Each structure stands twice: as C-alpha cells, then as structure tokens.
C-alpha cells in the first residue's frame, strides 16, 4: 500500500452514534430518552448512592 | 411503459349498444318490476357493461296504472319529506303519487334503486312511463320485451 490506498484492519474503526436526526435512523424524535420524567431533561445526572 | 399487453376494454360513447325496449306493468309488483327496470337502465344485461358509461337501454313502461301493491301499502306506506322551514315535515302516500300521475310514482321508486351520482341522475332520464297502451315513439323502432323472462 501507499498513502493513496490506506486501509485499517477489518472491524478496527466504527462510526459513532448520532441521535435526533430523523425517523429513518431509528434515533430521532425523543432521541433514545423516552417521554417524560427527570431522566429525559437536559442536565439530568444520577446521584451516586441514591 | 406498458407491460400488460392483455387488457379489459371499457366501452365508450361510440361503442355502446343502446336500444329502446317496451315493458308492461299489467299485474307486476311495483318494487319487483322496478328492480328489473333499474337493471335494464343501468345495463347489467349487456356483456360490455361499463360502470362509468351510460350503456343501458331506454325503457318505455306501458300500463303503468295497472301496477299492484300488496298488503296495505297503498295507504299504509308513509313517505316523509321536509320543506326546510320549522315545523315543516310532510307525509304522502303511493296513492297520492298515483293520483298525481303514475310516472311520478315510478320515477320515485326507480330513483332509489339507481346509483346516487351524476351518472344515475343522467340515467333516470332514459325511462318513459305511460298510463295506457298508447304512446308515440316512432322513428326509433322499440322492441317489445317480456319482463317475466328476466
């Protein structure tokens, strides 16, 4: 190979997850969060030990 | 592009086979005769029947006043209508229609067995009802038909 035909090993790289970008992706709308409650809001975190 | 190459052909204004027929109402029941008349007008007896074309027959009914209504229907069937004003419901009977004229009763019965659209509104004009056996429809040569055969 050279600089014009570079190739990583099979399965070495993988595309990241992108949410909130439409219905076809399966990750739009509520964007994997469910509907309501505390865990659906921006800035929710888990109180560890609670 | 067309990959069918074997279609069913619809009749049109230039390909229909319209005929004038004469039927008699000497002792027939009103509804039972009018169902067959509706089939004749619609064109259910023609092998090239097409539901979007006026492809039926022009029907002349003679001896309309000899039609028979069984039971107490001549005065016990209450037709209701409304004038559009408050307290404006009215009643009338097949006897009232017959007194007005047999063509009115026959038209009322057949419109009701015909389809409820523009085509049916056009079809109802192909029916001709006469009280006696004398009518004037020369130049078209109508064909007598035995309604009991249908």
């Amino acid at each position: 190979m050279n600089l014009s035909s570079l190739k990583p090993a099979e399965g070495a790289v993988k595309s990241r997850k992108r949410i909130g970008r439409g219905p076809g992706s399966g990750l739009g709308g509520t964007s994997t969060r469910g509907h309501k409650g505390a865990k659906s809001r921006s800035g929710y975190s888990k109180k560890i030990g609670f | 592009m067309d990959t069918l190459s074997f279609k069913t052909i619809s009749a049109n204004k230039a390909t229909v086979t319209k005929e004038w027929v004469i039927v008699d109402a000497e002792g027939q029941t009103l509804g039972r005769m009018c169902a067959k008349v509706a089939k004749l007008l619609r064109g259910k007896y023609k092998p090239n029947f097409t539901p979007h074309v006026d492809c039926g027959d022009n029907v002349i009914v003679i001896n309309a006043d000899k039609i028979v209504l069984s039971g107490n229907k001549w005065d016990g069937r209450i037709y209701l209508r409304h004038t559009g004003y408050p307290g404006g419901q009215r009643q009338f009977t097949p006897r009232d229609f017959m007194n007005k004229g047999p063509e009115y009763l026959f038209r009322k019965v057949v419109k009701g067995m015909l389809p409820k659209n523009r085509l049916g509104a056009k079809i109802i004009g192909n029916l001709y009802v006469y009280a006696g056996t004398e009518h004037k429809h020369e130049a078209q040569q109508p064909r007598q038909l035995d309604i009991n055969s249908l």
Binding site: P23 | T3, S5
Partner: protein, 104 residues
C-alpha cells in the same frame, strides 16, 4: 387463429407474431427458443376447442427478444400517523419480452 394459453402462471390470448411481455424467465439468452404447451382454448377462425385436461397436442413456440425488461418504478410507502413510523422503498417488476413464432 388465436389460442388461450398460460405462460408463467398467467393466461394470455396469443396469435402469430405478437411480442408479449411475460414474467421473468431465468437463464435465457436473446434468440433462445422457449416452449409453452399448456393451451386451454384454441380458436381456428371459426372452430373452437376447449380442453379440460388442456388441449392435446396444442403448443406455442416463442423466441426471447429481451431477457430482462424492467417495469415502471412504483413507490412503496408505509406510514402510521402520530406514531413516527415511516418508510419509503422503490420497486420495479421484472419481465421478459418474447415473440411468438408458431401456434400449433
């Protein structure tokens, strides 16, 4: 002279030199001779024969002109309102065009 015969599970009325489109026939070439011997009716300009167990000896020989004709695209759409579910695919049916040489 016309016969009623079925080709790929569909009955067609065929005469001599007609250029039919039928459902795709696999592993054929241009000019290949195909044979169909399941005639149901034969009408020879006045004389009509109808076969229950088909018409014995009847036969239709055709030649393949195009081995793969694709039909017009159809949009396939599924949607359930207020649920977010939605998908839109495309479909093209596959045909082969034949020309009928001899009608026995």
């Amino acid at each position: 002279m016309y016969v009623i015969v079925d080709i790929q599970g569909q009955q067609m009325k065929v005469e001599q030199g007609r250029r039919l489109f039928v459902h795709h026939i696999k592993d054929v070439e241009s000019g290949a001779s195909v044979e169909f011997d399941k005639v149901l009716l034969v009408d020879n300009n006045g004389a009509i024969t109808v076969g229950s167990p088909l018409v014995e000896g009847a036969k239709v020989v055709c030649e393949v002109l195009t081995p793969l004709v694709k039909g017009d695209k159809v949009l396939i759409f599924h949607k359930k309102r207020r649920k977010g579910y939605r998908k839109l695919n495309g479909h093209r049916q596959q045909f082969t065009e034949i020309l009928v040489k001899e009608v026995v």
